[PDB]
């Protein structure tokens, strides 16, 4: 009776007769965490060692010690970007009241599928993200839905902007003669083809453009692929412009771009997963010129807001459209004015997101992240003057955001030289101050990334890894010949 | 100067100056939140009051005072699942220590983009999926992914088998002659329309096919469909088999379903998302006969094993169909003989959900779940038990599954006048016992539906509302007219 099969602290009764067991379990838990995460910088940003003894679920179960044992020992061999040494890649450190949010909703245990089971979570995303659109420069007709990831984001508005350009929706694209093309910068994310081929469009539908130095869009190149595409058998329906490029980090024209759209009657959308971020700055907004002009925006929190995954949204400038093109009348639940977010959404039953972004706006605030940015960006300008002034450093092109990919170019090494000596300072650096740098391969050669993303980190580490990076060109033997 | 414009408490700083402060917080929404939880019993299921005042992000960060007097307001008004009187829809209470897993995840902050992010996480999900899979009846060339939600497996699996017999990765679905055709039963999930429509196949593309009194597939019919379809232009290449379908729980007979399709040739996809579960049952195991004949299976372990949202696989006979129909050679990233998780995915970046998962199993082990789920069916077999020896009350159809769909069909009364008994039924019971019965309309009628995950729910509970019934029917107008 009573469950006598269960652990006492399986689950936590309704009743509240094992009240005392759940709370020394959570307290047990809490300590653990905090104890790990509070020497985040003591230990280095990334370890060689990986785990592969798992796949055998026991018979009877562990008891809470031994289960706490095997957690820690995974906790410390798991990746550590939370100290101030990791500036390789776009994650960085989560807000404390995110992670809190997260925690407090997972015990809820409600559902997006319908208001019914999230009687104010529904409401609450809908004027979060109402707000959010109204940033970017949308009116009251905008609208916008969450998603898990930028990559379910860009699939939905290219889903929306073909049926509404072909009107596919309840017939398909055997009849259709010419087949869609969709124009896409060189640079953009690889998520474009994915969303493409899961279309029926074509992984080869996707139309590269050419860029500039600075790995912009070159508007004379797009208008250029726009009219050979159409003077051949194929029809242009839509133009991807992207904010904030994976590897280095730049913007694309968004205004000529969208100009070149409206002539054309392209559907313009705008991928600012990294960029969007800006809008909550007020210096730096501005490089986002001409965003308000585009059908649909993708924007994910989690980058540049330091809110723990998963927070993403799409938003669009109509809000009809996405209650036409993508909306089915299938579903036959209880009648409410509200629309259920599962009807307009890729996914029906989703964790609520909104609680973790909604916290951190409060518990922030918007000068907090405004500061916040702009210290990422002081972060960069220093990173840049200093890797100008050395002759065998070179910058992959002008930064735009946070983000700098920078290469040593001795005069006497070749290419293939210069990429084993790009690897081995990576690895050199990575070895003596632990500071991780991404190496990415753009235009054909390896570049060591930095994403300044960290708040602690200071300039003073800045000046010590370029000392560093002086101290082994010099001590190479490349210079000695 | 120490980021003094930032709250003490808004990162946890990785030097560990303000553990102090980090460590008062997380105890203050620890104690919250076990209060909340502990008297979830006493409140009742269902709030019929909802809050409204949101989307004013404030200029300067509240303090966590009054954050946490607006987050238990929150609380107290979201939906409550976790009392024993909620018993109308597939939400249940979750297990504590997915709940704490989830939260260490969050506070990891790691990537399934790749193996570099989550050294550890991907070896132990494809290891834990590798086990599942077995325990399917697959061999060790099925292999699975992890996504969020049934509706993203269903995509999947559907955009693998339309890639697989078209060939359509590369140039398209415009060249393509003859519609695709699935068919699908009756009693399907409304994902498989918008999986559809998103392919481009069309959401007329589906093709339904007729249910037995019990709501499951007819095989003649079926095979008639068939039949007719390929008379005319089109050509069926999917048959979609659900094991218990959302309304009353029903499994289809996938054997003969296996066996028509390899007739026919057809790809046999199987959507157990609720029925799966069986699989840890030793007794109840054998309805799921002939699982191991489908090309793909989707399993949502979040509806059935009590681990908290979202947890969702899908699974492949066949891991080189995944690797080659799916995958797509563009992203040149670091090269490693192991498959990065986002290549052969609907979605890039996710979050790592294999640690609640591994974590319940491991606390709550096999033995127990086998236990839970027999448990489950024995309160089943009482409902139905109840359910009959009572001339006004009608059953749906037979159970298969842990749920039941009932209504009242008094001799007097017309179908309307039914109807409304039934809902006047239904708001009586949740306002006298505060127990809550969904209410769906099937085959053109209201029945009250009750889904029994909950184990606390005892059968002199079941016994209690079925008085309750039998007082509210002789007390209603209609008797003595
Ligand atoms: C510019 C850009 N677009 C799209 C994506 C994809 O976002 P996600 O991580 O959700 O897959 C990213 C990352 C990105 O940086
Ligand atoms: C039978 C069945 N198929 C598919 C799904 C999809 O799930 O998406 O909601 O998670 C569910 C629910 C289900 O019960």
Chains 1, 2 share one sequence.
Request: a negative charge; proline letters at 4%.
């Amino acid at each position: 009776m009573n469950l006598d099969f269960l652990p006492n602290d399986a689950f936590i009764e309704p009743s509240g007769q094992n009240i005392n067991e759940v709370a020394s379990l959570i307290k047990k838990f809490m300590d653990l965490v905090i104890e790990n995460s509070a020497s985040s910088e003591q230990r280095p940003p990334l370890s060689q060692i990986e785990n592969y003894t798992f796949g055998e679920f026991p018979v009877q179960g562990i008891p809470t010690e031994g289960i706490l044992l095997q957690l820690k020992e995974i906790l410390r061999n798991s990746m550590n970007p939370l100290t101030p040494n990791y500036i390789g890649h776009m994650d960085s450190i989560p807000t404390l009241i995110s992670c809190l949010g997260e925690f407090v909703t997972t015990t809820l245990n409600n559902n997006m599928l319908s208001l019914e089971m999230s009687p104010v979570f529904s409401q609450m995303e809908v004027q979060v993200l109402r707000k959010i659109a109204r940033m970017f420069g949308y009116d009251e007709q905008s609208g916008g839905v969450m998603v898990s990831g930028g990559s379910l984001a860009n699939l939905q508005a290219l889903a929306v902007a073909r049926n509404h350009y072909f009107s596919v929706k309840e017939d398909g694209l055997t009849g259709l003669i010419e087949q869609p093309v969709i124009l896409a910068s060189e640079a953009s994310h690889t998520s474009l083809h994915k969303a493409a081929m899961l279309l029926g469009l074509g992984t080869s539908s996707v139309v590269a453009v050419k860029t500039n130095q600075n790995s912009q869009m070159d508007t004379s190149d797009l208008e250029k692929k726009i009219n050979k595409t159409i003077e051949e058998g194929k029809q242009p329906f839509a133009v991807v412009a992207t904010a904030g490029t994976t590897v280095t980090g730049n913007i694309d024209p968004i205004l000529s771009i969208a100009e070149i759209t409206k002539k054309y009657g392209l559907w313009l959308h705008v991928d600012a997963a990294y960029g969007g971020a800006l809008v909550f700055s007020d210096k730096h907004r501005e490089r986002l010129s001409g965003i308000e002009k585009a059908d649909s925006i993708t924007f994910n929190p989690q980058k540049w807001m330091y809110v723990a995954k998963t927070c993403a949204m799409v938003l669009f400038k109509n809000r009809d459209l996405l209650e036409t093109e993508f909306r089915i009348s299938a579903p036959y639940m209880n009648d409410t004015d509200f629309t259920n977010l599962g009807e307009i959404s890729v996914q029906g039953t989703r964790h609520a997101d909104i609680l973790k972004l909604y916290l951190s706006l409060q518990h922030i605030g918007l000068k907090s992240y405004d500061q916040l940015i702009n210290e990422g960006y002081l972060r960069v300008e220093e990173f840049v003057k200093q890797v100008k002034q050395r002759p065998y450093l070179e910058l992959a092109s002008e930064p735009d955001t946070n983000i700098c990919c920078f290469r040593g170019r001795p005069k006497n090494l070749d290419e293939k030289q210069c990429d084993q000596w790009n690897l081995e300072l990576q690895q050199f650096l990575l070895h003596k101050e632990r500071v991780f740098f991404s190496l990415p391969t753009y235009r054909g050669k390896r570049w060591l990334r930095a994403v300044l993303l960290n708040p602690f980190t200071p300039i003073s580490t800045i000046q010590k890894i370029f000392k560093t990076i002086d101290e082994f060109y010099i001590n190479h033997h490349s210079y000695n010949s």
